[PDB]
């Protein structure tokens, strides 16, 4: 009897959605149309290539913390898209479509998983891969060079899916004044989730211990 709302309504119940908005963006996003196996089971479920689409619980509580710089007009990128499962939230949340000034970008370092995620999308919601200012692109982060670098600009939003052995400071140089960036760096024996924003040209604010899977260097 698992259905895409009740994990939404679960999740309110347990405190890990307390927000209208965190709540509405993931209600328009089923969660069994970007994984098959157990999708509304609260836990991360495995794709392909070591990885995981991450629990409904870390999607949720990234997107809270995202939510008030995810907005029509602004710019997002989502680093480590896997499943494209929050970058379609970050495409809803932004209207991509039908707000030309909003843009979202995913980065997946695995070309299979670009494509799983390009599977799902069309399936979900095709409108999505017919236009400008939406993309998920076969890249690792770690491989951005100058002339792309300049060429992505800045972004309000940066989510990183993966755990960071340091924080890259191209995430820091995409990074817009007043933009948020979300990712788990490394800290001794944990992985610590990180809210990084700008003010002038940064504030780290340690969240609190998670899991997740590496964030690739090659
Ligand atoms: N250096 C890197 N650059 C871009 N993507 C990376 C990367 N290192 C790991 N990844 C990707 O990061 C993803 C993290 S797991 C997937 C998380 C995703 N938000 C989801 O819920 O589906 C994996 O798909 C992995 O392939």
Redesign the pocket.
């Given at each position: 009897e698992n259905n895409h709302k009740s994990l939404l309504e679960n999740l309110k119940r347990r405190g890990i959605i307390d927000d209208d908005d965190v709540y509405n963006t993931m209600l328009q996003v089923d969660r069994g149309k970007y994984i098959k196996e157990i999708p509304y089971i609260d836990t991360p479920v495995y794709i392909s290539?070591g990885?995981?689409?991450?629990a409904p619980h870390m999607?949720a509580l990234s997107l809270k913390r995202l939510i008030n710089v995810l907005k029509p007009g602004s710019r997002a990128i989502?680093?480590?898209?896997?499943?494209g499962?929050?970058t379609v939230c970050m495409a809803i949340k932004m209207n991509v479509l039908e707000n030309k000034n909003s843009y979202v970008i995913g980065?997946?370092?695995?070309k299979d998983?670009v494509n799983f995620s390009l599977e799902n999308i069309k399936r979900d919601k095709p409108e999505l891969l017919k236009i400008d200012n939406f993309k998920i692109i076969h890249?690792?982060?770690?491989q951005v060079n100058e002339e792309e670098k300049k060429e992505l600009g800045l972004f309000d939003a940066i989510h990183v899916?993966?755990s960071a052995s340091e924080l890259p400071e191209i995430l820091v140089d995409l990074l817009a004044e007043n933009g948020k960036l979300i990712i788990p760096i490394e800290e001794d024996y944990t992985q610590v989730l990180y809210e990084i924003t700008k003010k002038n040209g940064i504030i780290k604010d340690r969240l609190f211990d998670v899991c997740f899977?590496?964030?690739?260097?090659n």
């Open positions: 290539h990885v995981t689409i991450s999607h989502d680093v480590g898209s896997g499943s499962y929050l980065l997946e370092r695995v998983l890249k690792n982060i770690y899916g993966a899977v590496s964030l690739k260097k």
